[PDB]
Nucleic acid binder design. Structure first.
Ligand SMILES: Nc1nc2c(ncn2[C@@H]2O[C@H](COP(=O)(O)OP(=O)(O)CP(=O)(O)O)[C@@H](O)[C@H]2O)c(=O)[nH]1
Ligand SMILES: CC[C@H](C)[C@H](N)C(=O)O
Ligand SMILES: [Mg+2]
Ligand SMILES: [Mg+2]
Ligand SMILES: [Mg+2]
Ligand SMILES: [Mg+2]
Ligand SMILES: [Mg+2]
Ligand SMILES: [Mg+2]
Ligand SMILES: [Mg+2]
Ligand SMILES: [Mg+2]
Ligand SMILES: [Mg+2]
Ligand SMILES: [Mg+2]
Ligand SMILES: [Mg+2]
Ligand SMILES: [Mg+2]
Ligand SMILES: [Mg+2]
Ligand SMILES: [Mg+2]
Ligand SMILES: [Mg+2]
Ligand SMILES: [Mg+2]
Ligand SMILES: [Mg+2]
Ligand SMILES: [Mg+2]
Ligand SMILES: [Mg+2]
Ligand SMILES: [Mg+2]
Ligand SMILES: [Mg+2]
Ligand SMILES: [Mg+2]
Ligand SMILES: [Mg+2]
Ligand SMILES: [Mg+2]
Ligand SMILES: [Mg+2]
Ligand SMILES: [Mg+2]
Ligand SMILES: [Mg+2]
Ligand SMILES: [Mg+2]
Ligand SMILES: [Mg+2]
Ligand SMILES: [Mg+2]
Ligand SMILES: [Mg+2]
Ligand SMILES: [Mg+2]
Ligand SMILES: [Mg+2]
Ligand SMILES: [Mg+2]
Ligand SMILES: [Mg+2]
Ligand SMILES: [Mg+2]
Ligand SMILES: [Mg+2]
Ligand SMILES: [Mg+2]
Ligand SMILES: [Mg+2]
Ligand SMILES: [Mg+2]
Ligand SMILES: [Mg+2]
Ligand SMILES: [Mg+2]
Ligand SMILES: [Mg+2]
Ligand SMILES: [Mg+2]
Ligand SMILES: [Mg+2]
Ligand SMILES: [Mg+2]
Ligand SMILES: [Mg+2]
Ligand SMILES: [Mg+2]
Ligand SMILES: [Mg+2]
Ligand SMILES: [Mg+2]
Ligand SMILES: [Mg+2]
Ligand SMILES: [Mg+2]
Ligand SMILES: [Mg+2]
Ligand SMILES: [Mg+2]
Ligand SMILES: [Mg+2]
Ligand SMILES: [Mg+2]
Ligand SMILES: [Mg+2]
Ligand SMILES: [Mg+2]
Ligand SMILES: [Mg+2]
Ligand SMILES: [Mg+2]
Ligand SMILES: [Mg+2]
Ligand SMILES: [Mg+2]
Ligand SMILES: [Mg+2]
Ligand SMILES: [Mg+2]
Ligand SMILES: [Mg+2]
Ligand SMILES: [Mg+2]
Ligand SMILES: [Mg+2]
Ligand SMILES: [Mg+2]
Ligand SMILES: [Mg+2]
Ligand SMILES: [Mg+2]
Ligand SMILES: [Mg+2]
Ligand SMILES: [Mg+2]
Ligand SMILES: [Mg+2]
Ligand SMILES: [Mg+2]
Ligand SMILES: [Mg+2]
Ligand SMILES: [Mg+2]
Ligand SMILES: [Mg+2]
Ligand SMILES: [Mg+2]
Ligand SMILES: [Mg+2]
Ligand SMILES: [Mg+2]
Ligand SMILES: [Mg+2]
Ligand SMILES: [Mg+2]
Ligand SMILES: [Mg+2]
Ligand SMILES: [Mg+2]
Ligand SMILES: [Mg+2]
Ligand SMILES: [Mg+2]
Ligand SMILES: [Mg+2]
Ligand SMILES: [Mg+2]
Ligand SMILES: [Mg+2]
Ligand SMILES: [Mg+2]
Ligand SMILES: [Mg+2]
Ligand SMILES: [Mg+2]
Ligand SMILES: [Mg+2]
Lengths: 86, 392, 205
RNA sequence: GGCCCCUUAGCUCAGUGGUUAGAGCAGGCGACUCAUAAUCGCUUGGUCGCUGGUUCAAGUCCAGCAGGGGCCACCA
RNA sequence: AAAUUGAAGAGUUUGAUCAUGGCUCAGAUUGAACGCUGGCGGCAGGCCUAACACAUGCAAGUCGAACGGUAACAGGAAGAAGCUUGCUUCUUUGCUGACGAGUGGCGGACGGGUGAGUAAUGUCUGGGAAACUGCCUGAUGGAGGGGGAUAACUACUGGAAACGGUAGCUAAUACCGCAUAACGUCGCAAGACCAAAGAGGGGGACCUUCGGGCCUCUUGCCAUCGGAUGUGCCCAGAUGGGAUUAGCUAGUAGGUGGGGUAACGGCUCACCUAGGCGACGAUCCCUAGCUGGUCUGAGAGGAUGACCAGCCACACUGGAACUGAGACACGGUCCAGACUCCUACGGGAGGCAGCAGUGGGGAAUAUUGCACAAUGGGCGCAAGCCUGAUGCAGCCAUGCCGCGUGUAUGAAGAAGGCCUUCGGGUUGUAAAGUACUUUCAGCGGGGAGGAAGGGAGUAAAGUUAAUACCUUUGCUCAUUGACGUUACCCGCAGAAGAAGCACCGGCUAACUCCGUGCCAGCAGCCGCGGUAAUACGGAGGGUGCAAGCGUUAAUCGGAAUUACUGGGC
């Protein structure tokens, strides 16, 4: 740049992306683990995966990386999917 | 960004004149290099001067080149002139503004027609002080012929009212001095010493409305149109309003910026070669031959009467009388314009040695007032000179 | 913004003295009124509708001394008001300052009044007004400044205008030279040699 | 600032320095008509762009300008 | 009471007439341009063409009362030049005020520029439901305890530079768990699950490892339901020309399921159904930002979108996304391309449609100015810093408005021009003469308003254990103006410094001589000139405007000559 005030901002922006990517990856990994658990047909495994997936998405939504409605959609879709099968 | 100028040492103008290819660009480069070597910071180069393609392709000079140096007596501005016989107007422009002249004569070639022409036009413009510097003494060093060359150049100078038997002569070669040997640059020091001693300080009359003849026009990118010239008499300051009067119709503008050798000057006193930036002027409008003066100082004229003396015989010029319809080129200040002349009842013939009264009309008007010195020249021959008698 | 030439030529063209001189003498011994100016004065060719309209408009303009732009603005303003346009135009041009100064005897002619107004010598309601066309409203006191009361021209013209008719709406004391309005004027108080409907026709084309 | 080009009657044009620079289409005069066109009877016309030089001798050989046209530079 | 008072024709087809029908004229206006001329001020306006290319300098920062520290500056002691034994001279302290670079917070998405793209992904009017929202505000609550890191810095070192790398050390309102939890999320239910940050002022009652503990006050920090502002989404109607453009569409029209977004939705995929738009003009090609409004007209209409206000689109050209409450971001990031620069040849840097300025294009459009004094804006507790927004100044008869270039009396009806009937008439009271006034400009002298506030002192009342810090109100005391030599007033000498342009056959206001001779020329339309020209050229006289006057370009009117109001075969 050329104004010595946006360079600082670029620095925080790249640091923030580098910090956010790991959290997004971890959250996606846990959710897709849940999806695979439904896929296999193992209701106990899917239920357990949901049980320790709930805290992750809720804490991330509180941190703000996602939105309350996003976590609610994930939680509700997974609950309906799991409770359908038995 | 720019560096200002420190008004501490006196300013004066010098120039070089002589026959073609007697080392005039080389001498200027050698003198500036030596002077910066002993004390200073100029140290000019050769090819940096001649920038035009024809300059480097043909090994000649087409115009006048500006340089600067100083000694712990004064500060000198130098002008480099051509030597050919069809670039005369540039040499006249160079000689008009220069207070001091140095004439270059080579012992190999001796005096040549162009040297005589340069001396004659210097006399007809009125250069007060000329110093002669012999050139190419590296290849000839015989005492028994340099005396003959010195006698010849003294005769040439003395023939036309210059002091010849008291003016000094310096012998040396510029090429060795520019090379940088251990002994051939002392001749440069002697030339500079004789330059300072032989040029007494002239008057600095800055007590009348500002006037500036125009000699060259430039376009500085980003900034605009710039005129160049040496201030004759007066003083100008940034923000003042001046007026352009000359061949074309009169206009006005303001001096919004001054410079000198790309070094800023707060206020230009009379007698300095400076460049002035003018607001809101397209390049083709302002041309050399015009005048830039303070408002209410001079006005244009077309017809006026003067006293003209055709050059007497055995001095050059011509050999025949003139009559009605004669259209010679008047050279006034810096401008050459061909106009018509008229002689009174009787004295129809023109004799070489009789000064007569004429009335001259010029096609392009010029900023003229009573008491101006103008020369006469046409057809590659200068015929006479005179001064203004009456403005009509 | 004024006229700076001969004065009697205007009346000679209009065929009537337009009060442009003081009145020390009579008009008949200053100019040949019945002879129009120039090399062509004897002949009297016949006019048209445009001719009569233009001649009347020029007559009124030369009487009061108002150039064309102000007159056109006056016409627009008079048509802008409520009522007849001719009466409105007469009221508007009768209510400007230099006309009132002339009608109150302080000046020999309209030009004398104009010099007095424009040289800052009149107080209206105590304050200095400098402008010739300053519009004046009822109940305005007009007076001269105390520095100018020693002039000879004003005293000469004070006891020279009583031969003319006394205006019925400019109550004046000539001793302390103090004047006042009461209300607007009317056609009953104005001369009978103007046909304003010609002007209304001319600007309605 | 430098180099190369064009200048003949109103339009279009010829004119290889030995003595007044010619052609065509034009044009004026005398008759006839209110005035012409046509038919007649005579036909005048020139700074060779200007100025100055060399030749015994020049628009024509030589130089400087006038104006226009085609390129090349230069950057307080 | 008022917000209405409004409607004009002429010239030209023929030997003459009536009718039809085109051409021309009289009015109003403009971001204007050219020619001649040019005294002053007030309020406005000023690249319409190359969204062509840009030299130089400014246009976005602030917080120490979040933090680690001391690069610069100002506050002490001892050594220590001489003694008037500290007169004077020099070196050693982050304890304090302040603060360069660094972590952290907020802003940088506002304000400013341009109209290229866009005929409906936009705008205008009227409605709606499936959403989010920093700062501002109300209510009810929480505010417990731990942990691992890194910049600056220290040592080494790469590199032309930009910019790096290696090994240790350190602070938080930087980051990550834990502790509890709801009116909150999911769930029929039962249940399962998620947060926090500390700073600053003063000190009485009570103790120190003398760090502070301890009381109160101001401000923050986190969760839920509201108010306001703002933004995203949907529907109906209105929004230029061409049929010498008639058919267009396969994610295309609908349905089920999965996914995705702050939110509904073919937004996206797998499969099913075979539909959907179109003479009420789809599709296709050309031109174009839209509105409140502006000019014109008696209205109905016609032309249009310069200045100001609302909305939209763009930021050298083509793409894409991160960060954030808000962007796919004018003075940010990544890649590609065309131009311009630095380079040690390995590699680097740049984007005026921000303010001035330059070249070029054009009939044609301005200074590389002053200041934060006032109004708004960012940051901060405040003081205060920044602001080419803004308030002013400069250049331009570009527009509207105002004023002056003197006022009287004066026949000898003078010289001088011009005409003549030779008698005389005219320019003309015009001049010259005599008597008065000083607007504006010239010089000098005095001198409002835009200024609210901020600072200091003092007192009363508030909350607390407290006369303490802090807050409110009063009062008191010296200062804040670029414009600026403001506006305005007074004095001086003197009519003293200040008038041009078009027209004169008819339409249309205003007439005669000389020159020329269908030649030279004029012309908005009829038309003038062939040897006695009110029409060409000059002069005298006259008419119309006036610091302007004319010509060219463009729009409505007249034109009932696109006829809805209001025409014909
Ligand atoms: N040995 C020697 N050589 C010389 C001398 N002077 C000039 N020269 C040589 O002559 C060459 C050309 O001379 P130059 O300097 O161009 O002459 P000039 O007079 O300046 C050319 P102009 O007249 O156009 O300005 C140069 O390259 C230089 O080397 C001298 O004194 N001695
Ligand atoms: C002598 C002229 C010089 C170049 C000057 N300093 C410029 O111009
Ligand atoms: Mg991965
Ligand atoms: Mg040279
Ligand atoms: Mg008058
Ligand atoms: Mg008047
Ligand atoms: Mg009205
Ligand atoms: Mg009307
Ligand atoms: Mg009309
Ligand atoms: Mg009619
Ligand atoms: Mg008419
Ligand atoms: Mg006809
Ligand atoms: Mg006829
Ligand atoms: Mg008709
Ligand atoms: Mg009308
Ligand atoms: Mg002009
Ligand atoms: Mg013109
Ligand atoms: Mg002009
Ligand atoms: Mg431009
Ligand atoms: Mg533009
Ligand atoms: Mg435009
Ligand atoms: Mg550009
Ligand atoms: Mg800069
Ligand atoms: Mg601190
Ligand atoms: Mg403090
Ligand atoms: Mg602290
Ligand atoms: Mg803070
Ligand atoms: Mg300091
Ligand atoms: Mg500290
Ligand atoms: Mg401290
Ligand atoms: Mg401070
Ligand atoms: Mg700081
Ligand atoms: Mg903001
Ligand atoms: Mg705009
Ligand atoms: Mg717009
Ligand atoms: Mg509409
Ligand atoms: Mg810890
Ligand atoms: Mg190094
Ligand atoms: Mg900690
Ligand atoms: Mg951690
Ligand atoms: Mg927890
Ligand atoms: Mg903590
Ligand atoms: Mg608190
Ligand atoms: Mg907004
Ligand atoms: Mg409508
Ligand atoms: Mg429209
Ligand atoms: Mg679904
Ligand atoms: Mg989002
Ligand atoms: Mg939709
Ligand atoms: Mg467009
Ligand atoms: Mg537009
Ligand atoms: Mg519309
Ligand atoms: Mg309308
Ligand atoms: Mg109307
Ligand atoms: Mg109508
Ligand atoms: Mg109207
Ligand atoms: Mg009506
Ligand atoms: Mg009306
Ligand atoms: Mg528009
Ligand atoms: Mg615009
Ligand atoms: Mg606007
Ligand atoms: Mg504005
Ligand atoms: Mg831009
Ligand atoms: Mg882009
Ligand atoms: Mg580009
Ligand atoms: Mg985000
Ligand atoms: Mg920019
Ligand atoms: Mg600009
Ligand atoms: Mg320009
Ligand atoms: Mg141009
Ligand atoms: Mg112009
Ligand atoms: Mg400035
Ligand atoms: Mg500005
Ligand atoms: Mg003008
Ligand atoms: Mg003005
Ligand atoms: Mg006016
Ligand atoms: Mg007389
Ligand atoms: Mg006479
Ligand atoms: Mg005040
Ligand atoms: Mg006319
Ligand atoms: Mg006319
Ligand atoms: Mg008319
Ligand atoms: Mg007319
Ligand atoms: Mg008439
Ligand atoms: Mg004429
Ligand atoms: Mg005609
Ligand atoms: Mg005649
Ligand atoms: Mg005539
Ligand atoms: Mg005007
Ligand atoms: Mg027109
Ligand atoms: Mg028109
Ligand atoms: Mg109509
Ligand atoms: Mg008609
Ligand atoms: Mg009909
Ligand atoms: Mg029929």
């Amino acid at each position: 740049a050329n104004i010595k005030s946006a360079k600082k901002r670029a620095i925080q922006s790249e640091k923030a992306r580098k910090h956010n990517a790991s959290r997004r990856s971890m959250m996606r990994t846990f959710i897709k683990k849940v999806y695979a658990a439904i896929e296999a047909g193992d209701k106990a495994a899917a239920q357990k995966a949901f049980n320790e997936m709930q805290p992750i998405v809720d804490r991330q939504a509180a941190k703000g990386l996602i939105h309350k409605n996003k976590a609610a959609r994930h939680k509700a879709n997974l609950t309906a999917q799991i409770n359908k099968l038995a | 960004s720019k560096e200002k100028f420190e008004r501490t040492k006196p300013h004066v103008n010098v120039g070089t004149i002589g026959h073609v290819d007697h080392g005039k660009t080389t001498l200027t480069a050698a003198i500036t290099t030596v002077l910066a070597k002993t004390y200073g910071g100029a140290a000019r180069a050769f090819d940096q001067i001649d920038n035009a393609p024809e300059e480097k392709a043909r090994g000649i000079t087409i115009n006048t080149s500006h340089v600067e140096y100083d000694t712990p007596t004064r500060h000198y501005a130098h002008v480099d002139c051509p030597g050919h016989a069809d670039y005369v107007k540039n040499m006249i422009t160079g000689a008009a503004q220069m207070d001091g002249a140095i004439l270059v004569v080579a012992a190999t070639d001796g005096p040549m027609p162009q040297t005589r022409e340069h001396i004659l036009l210097g006399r007809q413009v009125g250069v007060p002080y000329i110093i002669v510097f012999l050139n190419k003494c590296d290849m000839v060093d015989d005492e028994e012929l340099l005396e003959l060359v010195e006698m010849e150049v003294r005769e040439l100078l003395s023939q036309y009212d210059f002091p010849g038997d008291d003016t000094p002569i310096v012998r040396g070669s510029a090429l060795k001095a520019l090379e940088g040997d251990a002994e051939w640059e002392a001749k440069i020091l002697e030339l500079a010493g004789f330059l300072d001693s032989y040029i007494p300080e002239p008057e600095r009359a800055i007590d009348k409305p500002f006037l500036l003849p125009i000699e060259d026009v430039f376009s500085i990118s980003g900034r605009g149109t710039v005129v160049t010239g040496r201030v004759e008499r007066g003083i100008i300051k940034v923000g003042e309003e001046v007026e352009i009067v000359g061949i074309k119709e009169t206009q006005k503008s303001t001096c919004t910026g001054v410079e000198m050798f790309r070094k800023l000057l707060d206020e230009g006193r009379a007698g300095e070669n400076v460049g002035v930036l003018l607001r809101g002027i397209k390049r083709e409008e302002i041309e050399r031959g015009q005048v830039l003066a303070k408002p209410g100082t001079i006005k244009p004229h077309t017809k006026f009467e003067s006293e003209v003396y055709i050059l007497s015989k055995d001095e050059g010029g011509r050999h025949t009388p003139f009559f009605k319809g004669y259209r010679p080129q008047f050279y006034f200040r810096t401008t050459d314009v061909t106009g018509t002349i008229e002689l009174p009842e009787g004295v129809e013939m023109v004799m070489p040695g009789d000064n007569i009264k004429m009335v001259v009309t010029l096609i392009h008007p010029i900023a003229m007032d009573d008491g101006l010195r103008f020369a006469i020249r046409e057809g590659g021959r200068t015929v006479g000179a005179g001064v203004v008698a009456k403005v009509l | 913004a004024r006229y700076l030439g001969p004065k009697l030529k205007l009346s000679r063209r209009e065929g009537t003295d337009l009060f442009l001189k003081s009145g020390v003498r009579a008009i008949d011994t200053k100019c040949k009124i019945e002879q129009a100016p120039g090399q062509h004065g004897a002949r009297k060719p016949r006019l048209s509708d445009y001719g009569v309209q233009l001649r009347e408009k020029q007559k009124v303009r030369r009487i009061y001394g108002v150039l064309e732009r102000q007159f056109r603005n006056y016409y627009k303003e008079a048509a802008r008001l409520k009522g007849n346009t001719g009466e409105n135009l007469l009221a508007l041009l009768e209510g400007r300052l230099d006309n009132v100064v002339y009608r109150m005897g302080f000046g020999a002619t309209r030009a004398e009044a104009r010099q007095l107004v424009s040289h800052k010598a009149i107080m209206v309601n105590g304050r200095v007004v400098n402008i010739a066309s300053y519009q004046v409203s009822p109940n305005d006191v007009v007076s001269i400044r105390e520095k100018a009361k020693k002039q000879s021209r004003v005293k000469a013209a004070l006891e020279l205008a009583e031969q003319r008719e006394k205006p019925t709406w400019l109550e004046v004391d000539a001793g302390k030279m103090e004047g006042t309005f009461k209300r607007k004027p009317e056609r009953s108080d104005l001369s009978a040699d103007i046909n304003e409907h010609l002007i209304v026709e001319l600007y309605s084309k």
